[PDB]
Amino acid sequence: IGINESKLLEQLLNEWVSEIENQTKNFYDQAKTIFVWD
Amino acid sequence: LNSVNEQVHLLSTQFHSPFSQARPSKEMEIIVDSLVEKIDRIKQTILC
Amino acid sequence: LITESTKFSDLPPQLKNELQILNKMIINNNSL
Amino acid sequence: RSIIEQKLYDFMQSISPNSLNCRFLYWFYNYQANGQLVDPNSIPKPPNVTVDQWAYALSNNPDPSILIPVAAKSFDDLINRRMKQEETIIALDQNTQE
Hints:
- The structure is cut from a larger assembly and holds one copy of chain A (38 residues), two copies of chain B and one copy of chain D (98 residues).
- Helix content of chain A is 76%, strand content 0%.
- Chain A is an all-alpha fold and 38 residues long.
- The relative contact order of chain A is 0.10.
- Chain B is an all-alpha fold and 48 residues long.
- Chain B is built from two helices and no strands.
- Chain B has helices at 2-10, 26-46.
- Chain D has 98 residues and is of the alpha+beta class.
- Chain D has a two-stranded antiparallel sheet with strand order 1-2.
- Chain D starts with a helix and ends with a helix.
- Classes of the chains: A mainly alpha (38), B mainly alpha (48), D alpha+beta (98).
- Chains in contact: A-B, A-C, A-D, B-C, C-D.
- Chain D: It is found in: Nucleus, Nuclear pore complex.
- Chain D: This is Nuclear pore complex protein nup54.
């Protein structure tokens, strides 16, 4: 995705912070699932 | 803009999703319904 | 200045490029 | 800087696997098929990891006699190990069937 030219930088930063914490959770649960398979 | 940009990205990590994306893709389902809505807009224009 | 109330339109084209690298890295994690 | 030029940069240093401050840092363990007992003081600490993070990787290893601690810092590192679980599953079935 290219960032929409109308968006505020505050909205974009809060949107990306939310997604990085979603991705942080799923990284640890997927890596924990890999560890059980080990 | 979003959906073209995701398939452009999936085809850039070279990532074979092991759960293969369901066939046809949900944006092709939506493209065929986007043809229906134009078809019925033409029907409702003929009738007007 | 840049304020957090700045739009993506207005941003210096260097920062505008780095933001379009960052937006790709965040989408990268969802693809993986 | 402005506040924003720090918020965005310290945020980018939270995603980047080359960062000491990466939010993604899992600790896996890998078995050493040499049958040779390794000194844990001889194991060369990974790049881009702190001393504190490596002390934890050595103190939570379930057998230091035969397992080396390995960091993962992105989903690329996770799947560069997931594909080797499938590689091992295929080999482990084939020797079970035979």
